[PDB]
Design a protein around this ligand. Structure first.
Ligand SMILES: Cc1cc2nc3c(=O)[nH]c(=O)nc-3n(C[C@H](O)[C@H](O)[C@H](O)COP(=O)(O)OP(=O)(O)OC[C@H]3O[C@@H](n4cnc5c(N)ncnc54)[C@H](O)[C@@H]3O)c2cc1C
Ligand SMILES: Cc1cc2nc3c(=O)[nH]c(=O)nc-3n(C[C@H](O)[C@H](O)[C@H](O)COP(=O)(O)OP(=O)(O)OC[C@H]3O[C@@H](n4cnc5c(N)ncnc54)[C@H](O)[C@@H]3O)c2cc1C
Lengths: 51, 205, 51, 52
RNA sequence: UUAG
């Protein structure tokens, strides 16, 4: 809608190639997964622990 | 309070420490080395100084960077971040100033403000500056709310707010520089009179 | 919609009675206004300065 | 790494400092007195230990 | 304002 506000994201990225400190690894893929799961939940379910 | 240490004081901010609100928006900096935090705090205090020295016009990001001396005007993204933070939280570019960057014709978001007192009016100007579509709903036939001035002829009498309670760290200090505010000091000389009408002796008061 | 996510707020509060450190004042009303203007803009226009 | 100092190590976290990510979610604490930050870091390190 |  022209002139509306767009605060939230929709497309998230995880995987081995998305983690700066642990690329090209299984544990790095693992951690990228946990990261976005937390970011998605933060953004859609709200982060109550930050108040 | 003088120089940049005073700009922080006048903005109700500690000049040698980052605040909770600043930590939230700059978590990278406050969790890191103390040297960087000093660089942040100087840019913050300096930018406030620039705005406070001339609050009658918009302080742009460009105008801020050129008024800065090295090494500080070298890290331009940090300066931009700090500027927008202050701009957004209303520490600079608030009130009534002559706009440099004109408003975008295309707006984003619609907000209804209920009441055009000072809190409503202040928020509206800010949201308008940020490019939002703002409309205020006011029950009275006037703005100001509990700021209610009686006028007849050139006589004036405030039935609402009347006193500015100090200018040291008061955002009304900035507003007074932007407005035709003719402030006047208050002689704290205050004689009493008992019900009978006779003045109260000095020593007793 | 049952089972949907509700991240954003809609009703904000300002005014003299909403500011802890400067209540019952004009400057306190003033500051409450600037606060919510920044919070509303943060939430609807997004805060680019936090990245 | 042993005790709570090791729980932090095993979680790739500094045991005596708050991280950028922690500062973001607990800005009240990190901007405040160092005593409180120690209380935070112990609870963090201790909770990690329990899980681990 | 048949809010965009
Ligand atoms: C030969 C080899 C040896 C390795 N050895 C080690 C090692 O010794 N130690 C170590 O730590 N790491 C090692 N790795 C790296 C590790 O395997 C990977 O980094 C990790 O498994 C990747 O996890 P990921 O979820 O990010 O990617 P992926 O495991 O590739 O997950 C991506 C998924 O998406 C699927 N997919 C692709 N396209 C589509 C599509 N259009 N539609 C739907 N699904 C699609 C894929 O089939 C796949 O299942 C090795 C990798 C290779 C290739
Ligand atoms: C007698 C008096 C003296 C004061 N003296 C001082 C002083 O000396 N120094 C100082 O710092 N402060 C002083 N104050 C306080 C100061 O005036 C107020 O705190 C400040 O003006 C309030 O700003 P506000 O926007 O929060 O509230 P308001 O100014 O009341 O704004 C609220 C607006 O909402 C309107 N409204 C109400 N109901 C509705 C409705 N259903 N629909 C639409 N609109 C509605 C109201 O008409 C009003 O315009 C004084 C207050 C009073 C009452």
């Amino acid at each position: 809608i022209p002139g509306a506000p767009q605060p939230i994201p929709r497309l998230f990225f995880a995987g081995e190639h998305t983690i700066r400190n642990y690329p090209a690894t299984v544990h790095g893929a693992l951690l990228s997964g946990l990261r976005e799961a937390g970011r998605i939940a933060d953004q859609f379910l709200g982060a109550m622990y930050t108040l | 309070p003088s120089g940049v240490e005073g700009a922080a004081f006048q903005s109700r901010l500690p000049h040698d420490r980052m605040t909770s609100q600043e930590a939230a928006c700059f978590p990278d900096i406050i969790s890191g080395p103390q040297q960087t935090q000093k660089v942040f705090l100087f840019i913050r205090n300096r930018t406030l100084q620039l705005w406070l020295d001339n609050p009658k016009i918009q302080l742009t990001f460009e105008a801020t960077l050129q008024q800065l001396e090295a090494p500080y005007n070298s890290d331009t993204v940090l300066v931009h971040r700090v500027h927008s933070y202050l701009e957004r939280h209303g520490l600079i570019n608030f009130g009534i100033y002559k706009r440099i960057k004109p408003l975008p014709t295309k707006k984003t978001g619609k907000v209804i403000i209920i009441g055009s007192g000072v809190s409503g009016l202040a928020a509206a100007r800010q949201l308008q500056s940020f490019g939002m579509d703002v409309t205020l709903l006011e029950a009275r036939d006037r703005v100001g709310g509990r700021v209610a001035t009686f006028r007849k002829g050139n006589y004036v009498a405030d039935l609402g707010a009347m006193v500015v309670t100090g200018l040291g760290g008061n955002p009304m200090a900035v507003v007074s520089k932007q407005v035709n505010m003719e402030l006047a000091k208050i002689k704290q000389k205050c004689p009493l009179y008992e019900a009978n009408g006779q003045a109260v002796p000095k020593e007793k008061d």
